[PDB]
Structure 1
Amino acid sequence: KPWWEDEWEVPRETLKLVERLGAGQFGEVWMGYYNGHTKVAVKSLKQGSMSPDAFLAEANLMKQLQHQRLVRLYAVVTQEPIYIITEYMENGSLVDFLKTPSGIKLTINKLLDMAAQIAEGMAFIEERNYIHRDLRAANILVSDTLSCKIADFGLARLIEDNEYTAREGAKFPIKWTAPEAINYGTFTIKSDVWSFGILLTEIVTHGRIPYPGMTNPEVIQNLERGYRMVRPDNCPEELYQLMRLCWKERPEDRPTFDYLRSVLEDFFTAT
């Protein structure tokens, strides 16, 4: 729908930007209020830095992926400077939150709870025929009640035929991305499953970088030999074997996110 019929469009006047949370090459992220009372995150596009079409594509996708476990699109302002307004997540990114004094004190039981919550959001994405492609602890946000939601849908795509193929000059973080996506640019929900295994390491290490002490070429080399990431310190062997399932050589041998969810819920209720 055009902006004057779009239910997400709001007049810019409804928003007050209060605190800047980040600034980057492509704009800024702010904590703000809608109509005085409702706390929201506001992402603004820096004019000229990237296409306004490209920027808004993320909001359009979010219109199609609404679930409790996914950061919700709140509103858009589609006149420059373009805003994308989203659900405010009080405890920020999981990667940062696990390092705070609150995050540090979480038990393995709660970390397994959080992993299941993330699997639950990914299972919805999977059921809807989408892929995320940027699944990592930096892209999980944490609420004031210590619940987790999937965020950052910039790379997310609707799948028609199982598989999205990026351009052959496209680069993705080596440590988090499935080998077939790095090698061939071919992404499926099974690529996100591999990333989820990497994300589990970030959960259990309180946000430490995957593949301790290795460069990207070393990671690629070890993987091709059939090694997987070394058991993280203080990782329950159960969780480590679940990570390994995520890291199966053949994408189709990797489990579904529904399976991951159900297993992690069992892990959680046991602990």
Structure 2
Amino acid sequence: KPWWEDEWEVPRETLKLVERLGAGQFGEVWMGYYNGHTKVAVKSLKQGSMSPDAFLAEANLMKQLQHQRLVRLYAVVTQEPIYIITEYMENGSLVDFLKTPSGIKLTINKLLDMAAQIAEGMAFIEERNYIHRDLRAANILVSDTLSCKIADFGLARLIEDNEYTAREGAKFPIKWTAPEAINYGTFTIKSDVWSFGILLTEIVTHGRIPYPGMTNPEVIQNLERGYRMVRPDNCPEELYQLMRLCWKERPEDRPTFDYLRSVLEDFFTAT
């Protein structure tokens, strides 16, 4: 729909940017208020840094993916500078939160709780025939009530047929990305499952970088041998064995996201 007819389009006057949370190559991220009272997060596009159409594609995708466990699109300003306005998450990135004084005091119980909420969000995505492709602690946001939500749908895709294949020159974070997606550029919901496995190590290690003390080539090489990530410190063996299902050699052998939720809910209540 055209902006003058789009229900997500708002006048720019309704927004007040209060505090800059981040700045990068492609724009900024602010905490602000909509109509005076409603805390929102504003992502503004740096005019010229990238394509307005490419920028907005993230918003259009969020129109299709609405759920309590996914960070919600709030509105767009489609005149330059382009704004994407979203649900505000008071506790920010999971990778950052786990490192704060509060984050540090969480029981393994609450950690499993959180892990279950993420998998619940991914189950909705799995069921809607989407993939995320960028799943990792840095892209999970945390509310003021210590609940978690999927974020960053920049690379997220709808799957008409089974697979989305990226460019041959396309490059992805090597520690989080499934072998097939690194090697062949082929992504499926199953390659998100692999990332989920890695994310579990970030949760239990409180946001430490995966594969401690290993370069990418060493990581790619260990995997090809049949090795997986060394048991993280203080990791329940149950959770570790769950990570392992996520890291199965064949995509189709990796569990569903609905299975992972249900399993993580059993771990959680049993503690």
TM-score in terms of structure 1 length: 1.00
Partners of 1:8 and 1:113 lie apart in 2 by: 32
Q: Secondary structure at the match of 1:60?
A: helix
Partners of 2:167 and 2:95 lie apart in 1 by: 29
Question: What whole-Å deviation, never above 9, does each CA across 1:212-271 have from its counterpart, x for those lacking one?
Answer: 010000000000000000000000000000000000000000000000000000000001
Aligned to 1:127: 127
Partners of 1:146 and 1:256 lie apart in 2 by: 25
Question: What whole-Å deviation, never above 9, does each CA across 1:184-229 have from its counterpart, x for those lacking one?
Answer: 0000000000000000000000000000010000000000000000
- Number of equivalent positions: 271
1:162: how far off? 1.2
Partners of 1:145 and 1:60 lie apart in 2 by: 28
1:39: how far off? 0.1
Question: What whole-Å deviation, never above 9, does each CA across 1:51-103 have from its counterpart, x for those lacking one?
Answer: 00000000000000000000000000000000000000000000000000000
Question: What whole-Å deviation, never above 9, does each CA across 1:143-168 have from its counterpart, x for those lacking one?
Answer: 00000000000000000111100000
Alignment of 1:51-70 (within 5 A): 51-70=51-70
Partners of 1:235 and 1:85 lie apart in 2 by: 37
How much identity, in percent, do the aligned residues show? 100
Query: Cα RMSD over matched residues?
Result: 0.2
Partners of 1:125 and 1:86 lie apart in 2 by: 18
Q: Secondary structure at the match of 1:149?
A: strand
Partners of 2:190 and 2:162 lie apart in 1 by: 10
Q: Secondary structure at the match of 1:63?
A: helix
Question: What whole-Å deviation, never above 9, does each CA across 1:118-177 have from its counterpart, x for those lacking one?
Answer: 000000000000000000000000000000000000000000111100000000000000
TM-score in terms of structure 2 length: 1.00
